[PDB]
Enzyme design. Structure first.
Site, PDB file in Angstrom:
ATOM      1  N   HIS A  40     -16.076 -50.258  -8.315  1.00  0.00           N
ATOM      2  CA  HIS A  40     -17.099 -49.456  -8.984  1.00  0.00           C
ATOM      3  C   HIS A  40     -16.622 -48.849 -10.291  1.00  0.00           C
ATOM      4  CE1 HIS A  40     -15.541 -45.779  -6.629  1.00  0.00           C
ATOM      5  NE2 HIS A  40     -15.913 -45.178  -7.759  1.00  0.00           N
ATOM      6  N   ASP A  84     -14.813 -52.555  -2.121  1.00  0.00           N
ATOM      7  CA  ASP A  84     -14.680 -51.790  -3.376  1.00  0.00           C
ATOM      8  C   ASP A  84     -13.244 -51.859  -3.858  1.00  0.00           C
ATOM      9  OD1 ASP A  84     -15.234 -50.232  -5.518  1.00  0.00           O
ATOM     10  OD2 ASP A  84     -15.403 -48.330  -4.422  1.00  0.00           O
ATOM     11  N   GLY A 175     -13.882 -38.818 -10.779  1.00  0.00           N
ATOM     12  CA  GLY A 175     -12.791 -38.975 -11.732  1.00  0.00           C
ATOM     13  C   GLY A 175     -11.522 -39.437 -11.038  1.00  0.00           C
ATOM     14  N   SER A 177     -11.773 -41.713  -8.516  1.00  0.00           N
ATOM     15  CA  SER A 177     -12.140 -43.050  -8.101  1.00  0.00           C
ATOM     16  C   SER A 177     -11.137 -44.095  -8.557  1.00  0.00           C
ATOM     17  CB  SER A 177     -13.460 -43.513  -8.754  1.00  0.00           C
ATOM     18  OG  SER A 177     -14.556 -42.918  -8.094  1.00  0.00           O
ATOM     19  N   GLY A 178     -10.788 -45.029  -7.684  1.00  0.00           N
ATOM     20  CA  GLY A 178      -9.853 -46.085  -8.013  1.00  0.00           C
ATOM     21  C   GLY A 178      -8.402 -45.745  -7.787  1.00  0.00           C
TER      22      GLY A 178
HETATM   23  N1  LIG Z   1     -13.828 -38.203  -1.969  1.00  0.00           N
HETATM   24  C1  LIG Z   1     -15.096 -37.990  -2.482  1.00  0.00           C
HETATM   25  N2  LIG Z   1     -15.672 -36.902  -1.972  1.00  0.00           N
HETATM   26  C2  LIG Z   1     -15.723 -38.839  -3.454  1.00  0.00           C
HETATM   27  C3  LIG Z   1     -17.028 -38.588  -3.923  1.00  0.00           C
HETATM   28  C4  LIG Z   1     -17.636 -39.448  -4.864  1.00  0.00           C
HETATM   29  C5  LIG Z   1     -16.947 -40.568  -5.360  1.00  0.00           C
HETATM   30  C6  LIG Z   1     -17.589 -41.594  -6.269  1.00  0.00           C
HETATM   31  C7  LIG Z   1     -18.334 -42.810  -5.700  1.00  0.00           C
HETATM   32  C8  LIG Z   1     -19.525 -42.436  -4.793  1.00  0.00           C
HETATM   33  O1  LIG Z   1     -19.518 -41.604  -3.819  1.00  0.00           O
HETATM   34  N3  LIG Z   1     -20.657 -43.058  -5.277  1.00  0.00           N
HETATM   35  C9  LIG Z   1     -21.952 -42.702  -4.551  1.00  0.00           C
HETATM   36  C10 LIG Z   1     -22.032 -43.296  -3.142  1.00  0.00           C
HETATM   37  C11 LIG Z   1     -22.247 -42.448  -2.006  1.00  0.00           C
HETATM   38  C12 LIG Z   1     -22.407 -42.961  -0.696  1.00  0.00           C
HETATM   39  C13 LIG Z   1     -22.329 -44.345  -0.511  1.00  0.00           C
HETATM   40  C14 LIG Z   1     -22.123 -45.205  -1.604  1.00  0.00           C
HETATM   41  C15 LIG Z   1     -21.967 -44.686  -2.959  1.00  0.00           C
HETATM   42  O2  LIG Z   1     -22.101 -46.543  -1.197  1.00  0.00           O
HETATM   43  C16 LIG Z   1     -22.293 -46.479   0.245  1.00  0.00           C
HETATM   44  O3  LIG Z   1     -22.439 -45.082   0.649  1.00  0.00           O
HETATM   45  C17 LIG Z   1     -20.406 -43.866  -6.438  1.00  0.00           C
HETATM   46  C18 LIG Z   1     -20.572 -45.343  -6.133  1.00  0.00           C
HETATM   47  C19 LIG Z   1     -21.994 -45.883  -6.338  1.00  0.00           C
HETATM   48  C20 LIG Z   1     -20.889 -46.206  -7.379  1.00  0.00           C
HETATM   49  C21 LIG Z   1     -19.038 -43.320  -7.002  1.00  0.00           C
HETATM   50  C22 LIG Z   1     -19.316 -42.006  -7.807  1.00  0.00           C
HETATM   51  C23 LIG Z   1     -18.618 -42.115  -9.173  1.00  0.00           C
HETATM   52  C24 LIG Z   1     -17.964 -40.769  -9.411  1.00  0.00           C
HETATM   53  C25 LIG Z   1     -17.988 -39.961  -8.100  1.00  0.00           C
HETATM   54  N4  LIG Z   1     -18.626 -40.866  -7.084  1.00  0.00           N
HETATM   55  C26 LIG Z   1     -15.618 -40.812  -4.937  1.00  0.00           C
HETATM   56  C27 LIG Z   1     -15.033 -39.950  -4.003  1.00  0.00           C
END
Ligand SMILES: N=C(N)c1ccc([C@H]2[C@H]3C(=O)N(Cc4ccc5c(c4)OCO5)[C@H](C4CC4)[C@H]3[C@@H]3CCCN32)cc1
Ligand SMILES: [Ca+2]
Length: 223
Positions: A40, A84, A175, A177-178
């Site tokens: 993502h 992912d 921020g 992420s990854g």
């Molecule tokens: N540690 C954590 N609490 C945590 C929270 C949120 C994220 C990520 C990621 C995240 O939670 N989502 C929303 C999401 C929410 C629920 C879901 C998803 C996607 O797919 C299946 O179920 C995003 C993906 C769609 C691209 C991504 C977003 C980007 C910045 C922050 N978000 C990272 C870490």
């Protein structure tokens, strides 16, 4: 990282920052020419920044290297965040040293209760927005599959695990992420998703790297 601590400069030498004119995602160096991150986090125009502590000041030890290509898992689903994971090949090989070093891929999956280190430059508040200059660290355990599935019914695949604290207050966040989840010196997870940050009963969800080692190795050998 919410609820964490200042890691200390270059104490997490495999941590990288993905930059497109600003920090937007983390990643982990797995050899001198390849980084692992989250699918993502894909975008064009990625510069990989190695050896960073303060991401807003050139302090020394930084290496900035463009990405030559980014390989998103062919089965990544943007709806479910299953698979992912993405590989990034560097245009030139990094110079490895005490401050820039690779992290080992796992030979087996980690068990529930294993304590891991999660690191990143993401938001440090659960309500509101506060991004740090320097790298933050969090020690967190892997949760059992039953607790993970109870927290996120129907949404957890065999390629995911939960890690963190059900009582809240301590989590990765936007921020981060990854970035890496390192347990016993091996890369076991990639920061993937969650519900808000550091909320009660909603732990972080992480890509389960041990399920992808053969894919990583096969892909790197052919590229
Ligand atoms: N540690 C954590 N609490 C945590 C929270 C949120 C994220 C990520 C990621 C995240 O939670 N989502 C929303 C999401 C929410 C629920 C879901 C998803 C996607 O797919 C299946 O179920 C995003 C993906 C769609 C691209 C991504 C977003 C980007 C910045 C922050 N978000 C990272 C870490
Ligand atoms: Ca810097």
């Amino acid at each position: 990282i919410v609820g964490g601590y200042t890691c200390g400069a270059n104490t997490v030498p495999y941590q990288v920052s993905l930059n497109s004119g600003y920090h937007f995602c983390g990643g982990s160096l797995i050899n001198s020419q390849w980084v692992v991150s989250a699918a993502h986090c894909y975008k064009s125009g990625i510069q990989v920044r190695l050896g960073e502590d303060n991401i807003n000041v050139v302090e020394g030890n930084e290496q900035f290297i463009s990405a030559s290509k980014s390989i998103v898992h062919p089965s990544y689903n943007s709806n479910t965040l299953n698979n992912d994971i993405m590989l990034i090949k560097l245009k030139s090989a990094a110079s490895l040293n005490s401050r820039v070093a690779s992290i080992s891929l796992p030979t087996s999956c980690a068990s529930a209760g294993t304590q891991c280190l999660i690191s990143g430059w993401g938001n440090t508040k659960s309500s509101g927005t506060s991004y740090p200059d320097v790298l933050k660290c969090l020690k967190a355990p892997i949760l059992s599959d039953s607790s993970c599935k109870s927290a996120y019914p129907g949404q957890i695949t065999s390629n995911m695990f939960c890690a963190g604290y059900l009582e809240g207050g301590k989590d990765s966040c936007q921020g981060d992420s990854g970035g890496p989840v390192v347990c016993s010196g091996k890369l076991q997870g990639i920061v993937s998703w969650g519900s808000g940050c550091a909320q009660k009963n909603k732990p972080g969800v992480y890509t389960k790297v041990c399920n992808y080692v053969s894919w990583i190795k096969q892909t790197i050998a052919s590229n």
